[model samples]
Target: NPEYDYLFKLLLIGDSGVGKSCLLLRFADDTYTDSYISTIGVDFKIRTISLENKTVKLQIWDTAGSYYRGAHGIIIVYDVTDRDSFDNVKQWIQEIDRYAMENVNKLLVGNKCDLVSKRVVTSDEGRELADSHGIKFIETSAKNAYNVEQAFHTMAGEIKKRVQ
Candidate 1:
């Protein structure tokens, strides 16, 4: 049996239109969409899995970037093609520090990886940010269904490791 009944609470924090909602949809539903309705306030999802011979449930929270709030499992997502979103990562971190639990598991996600040419934030740059903050980094695309699941899974696994 696992030590904890739940793996952990995960939260997505980022700027608008950065595909935070799309990433959540792709992970929770195992499906992708090119276009969809925008998220309001916050969207929530859950996934249960067997890990370490125990049932571990993951609660995913996707928040409205407009509100400047925070929660556990703070992942800062950005559109690979959108420099503004990438630029706001540090600010999101600040908000997390201000409003969420301290010592939260953090990850820097560069979403919309399908747009490589228009990408203003390079993988190296994103990695640099992650390294500077001592957090993991992942690039994903919900549009082309590229590593979107991997991003969520990897982040969840990281949180599990940290909590355990």
Candidate 2:
């Protein structure tokens, strides 16, 4: 059944090995992968989210997850263990600032939350950054499918509200 008339375009941007692809796979197929592969150019998926009386189609684009500053409406992601990926997340914000529109909805995602033991970037820091930037932050574990569905649903809700 069609619930929404409008389609929402969502782009996922982050550095390599932040599990962007994994997150997409988990959300779309509810599957997890142990081995990682680099995204060649861009990965894409679409999911219809039912909210209230509407079904909104979320057109999700998972970019190459490179350090390149070309993505629009970026979602910065990082692994808790890799400090460099965490640091590169900040650059992703800057990339959106430089490239995306002013009203672009940006999000910060901390992936690999499954490994809570070796976490370097605390949740406090992640929330702080998201709050300061007025963007939503979510900690997700694609392997366990933790918060993966919620993330896209929340993003879809936000976009629906904005467009309405």
Candidate 3:
């Protein structure tokens, strides 16, 4: 049944091997992959979430290579352990602003956050960047599955508000 209410098209974008697909796996399938799987063109997954008694079907796209013509929420993911990945967040935002929709829901996610001892990007740092870009932020672990659902749902909620 194509009877679901809101359909949110979201994208997970950032550096390769930063756990974009794994985040999708954790959120959509509730599974985690230990091995590194790099996204070539783009990966797709769908899951419907219930918020405010509304069915939000999330059509998520995982793409590190980046084109992004039409997207509702563009999540700029970075590895908490990798400083270089965080450094590239600004550039990713540029791509989104230029190539994607204007006033689209933007989220900054720092993945691989379970590796605390190895974490170079702090949570406040992520939040700071998020504020600077006018986007919401969250730290997630596709491994432990921490905040993966929250990340998706919050963005979905933001999209829903804009959609309303």
Cα lDDT listed for each candidate:
0.77, 0.76, 0.87
Model 3 per-residue lDDT tens digits across residues 83-130: 999999989898788878888988899999899899998899999999
**Which sequence of candidate numbers ranks them by TM-score, best first?**
3, 2, 1
Off by over 4 Å in 1: 1-4, 40-43, 64-70
Query: Over 4 Å off in model 2, which ranges?
Result: 1-3, 39-43, 64-73
Per-residue lDDT tens digits of candidate 1, residues 84-124?
A: 89888988887777767777778899998888788888999
lDDT score, residue 47, model 2?
79
Q: Compared to the true structure, candidate 2 yields what TM-score?
A: 0.86
RMSD of each: 3.1, 3.1, 2.1
lDDT of 1 at 80: 84
- Can you write out model 2's per-residue Cα lDDT over 83-116, one digit (the tens) per residue? 8888887787886786676566677888898898
Worst 10 residues of 3 by lDDT: 35-44
Ranking by lDDT: 3, 1, 2
lDDT of 3 at 18: 82
